[model samples]
Target chain A: SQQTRVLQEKLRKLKEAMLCMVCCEEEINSTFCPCGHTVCCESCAAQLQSCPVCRSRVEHVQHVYLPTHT
Target chain B: SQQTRVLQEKLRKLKEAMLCMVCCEEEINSTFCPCGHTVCCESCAAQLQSCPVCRSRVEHVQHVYLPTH
Candidate 1:
């Protein structure tokens, strides 16, 4: 079942990417500043000054709803 | 078969991410300079001076093999 396992792993990783990078408790709902890095939920993004992935200065945070099926 | 459809969609998207951004014809094999963006194959990456995704100045390109199942 390697193919099935790989498929399941891909699904797991997709779900992982959907989760917030900051608190890991919620799905991502915002992107960081002008860097446009989307890694965490809105509330968690509000408490940051720099992007966790790129370390770019976070000038602002904007709510975003990415297209995906649950 | 909605669950199967969603699974197939996820597989298609994951495969899409593995493709090169520059040519959309090769698997990504290199990452852009200090910006740490990985979007294209080495040959295509060699032809650019900036990260396609972030527009960062590409000081150099490095070969990388990402983990996958």
Candidate 2:
């Protein structure tokens, strides 16, 4: 039972990680640059002059996730 | 076994749909108005005067996605 539960949990985490926060596109991985804008991937972040949401200069960026928290 | 097969099929479909619509272009930062065209990033959209496809005048542009799927 534990093994099955663990596998399910891992699958859920993987699914969450792959989700795109911006457009809700599948198979996307989030990345952020020093400008703090969260893009769908690394290539997108390179073109930003500032954060897309707040228009603030990104000092730092990171990939964050929203956990299901079951 | 049935569950596994269904999951694999779903994954395949997801992968196909997940690909970026604009290739390696930058993410959509804003929307182009009047013309209703979406391009890479807000800066690029701002630089454009007309819709690339229809060549219509854009009344306003908002930051949005291209809607791949």
Candidate 3:
């Protein structure tokens, strides 16, 4: 139970950090690269090729982490 | 004819410079702000609430330029 609690806490923080750039509501599904920015989901990432902030290109991306709750 | 060619060149450059902030492949759909930044399109802008660069909130934006050529 303690282990589970700790895991949950970590998950919560991760979720918070992974907030989408566009909506700012959902967790990032995949991290976009070249720019390495994170956003909500695959559809969102696929819609564009660069980061919204700096206008950097997004070329390579991958999904490496899984959220605790999801 | 020479004058028309010159105008066309300028327009081409302007259009290239307005390339999308996101994919860098297409023109921007709409500008986003508060941060006042431009991305590739409205769908891209809506997916994130903050600027990807500074991570600041995007509150308002406008399109004020038209490329000429």
Candidate 4:
């Protein structure tokens, strides 16, 4: 026997993390700057020069995080 | 010198608070039940029997929170 899929889905959401550090809204579409400040998103990161983590130069933003769906 | 756009954006996120109390992710889309434990979301809350804060029976739910921007 297993619990209904719906409630299980709800529990799944309970384990989610802050994909977008800035808005904490969107699902962190695709990005974090070079310095590993993967908290912000593509649009949000674009508005920055140095990585938010260490204030290092922001170049070559790596665009990925926990696949589109877990 | 005025800080660049990127730095400012990062600062803005830092100022933001944990919208969801359960996972501390996704902006809090709803409210906690009778005990007023305001921490989880609609889907998350429905699964729980009592409020996470006080551990009381969760009857009808009420959902509300800050600007969902």
- Candidate number of the best DockQ: 1
- Model 2, which residues run further than 4 Å from truth? A1-70, B1-24, B65-69
lDDT (Cα, tens digit) per residue for candidate 2, span A1-70: 4555555554566566554555555433333433333345544554656766567775543432211111
Candidate 4 per-residue C-alpha lDDT over B1-69 given as tens digits, one digit per residue, 9 for 90 to 100: 133444444434442343455665665444443454545667777778877767778764554322223
Per-residue lDDT tens digits for candidate 4, residues A1-70, read 1334444444345424435666666654333333444456578767777766567786655443221223
Q: Model 1, residue A63: displacement in angstroms?
A: 25
Q: Residue A46: error of model 4 in Å?
A: 44
What TM-score, computed on C-alpha atoms, does each candidate reach? 0.50, 0.31, 0.33, 0.35
List the DockQ of the predictions in order: 0.09, 0.03, 0.01, 0.02
Query: How do the residues B21-50 of candidate 2 rate in per-residue lDDT, one tens digit apiece?
Result: 334344444434534344435666566677
Question: Which residue pairs in candidate 1 collide?
Answer: none
Model 2, CA-based lDDT: 0.46
- What digit string (tens of lDDT, one per residue) describes model 3 on residues B1-69? 454555555445544554665666665534444443444455666677777656778664333221110
Over the true interface, candidate 4 deviates by an RMSD, in Å, of: 21.5
Error of 1 at B12 (Å): 0.5
Error of 1 at B48 (Å): 0.4
lDDT of each: 0.68, 0.46, 0.51, 0.50
Q: What is candidate 3's TM-score for chain B alone?
A: 0.50
Residue A26 in model 1: shift from native, Å?
15
Range of the 10 consecutive residues with the lowest summed lDDT in candidate 1 chain A: A61-70
Superposition error at B46 for model 1 (Å): 0.8
The true-structure Cα RMSD of candidate 2 reads 11.1
Per-residue lDDT of candidate 1, residues A1-70 (tens digit)? 4556667887788677667776888876565656666668788889898888779898866554333313
| Candidate 4 regions with alpha-carbon error over 4 angstroms | A1-70, B1-16
Query: How good is the docking of model 1, by CAPRI class?
Result: incorrect
